[PDB]
């Protein structure tokens, strides 16, 4: 699924997102943006080999098992292809995790190098909220 800018601000904040750890909406949704382009059928391979999952390209390096990252961590309990899917329960339930590991949203490459420090707020701009 591809989804709407508006329709994953809303979908984010029912699954309680909106300044979860302090960000506000905007920054996840600014995040989704850069990461997968709202797609949540997005994956993408890093150099060592583990590969980038869903709309927010959560990596098997530590986070969920594909069967093709060996000697990885599974800390969300759940197969990589469970981030694929149109409802975007277990990302949302896994980014929570992620987010509270000490780093922060610094651990999303693209919101750090494309959110962090501008106008976050203008990506839930006209969204009925
Ligand atoms: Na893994």
Redesign the pocket.
Known sequence: KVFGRCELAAAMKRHGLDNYRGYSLGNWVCAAKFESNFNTQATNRNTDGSTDYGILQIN???????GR?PG???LCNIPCSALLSSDITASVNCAKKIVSDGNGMNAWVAWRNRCKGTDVQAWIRGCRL
Not at 60 to 66: A, E, F, G, K, L
């Open positions: 098997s390096r530590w986070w969920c098992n594909d990252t990885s961590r599974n």
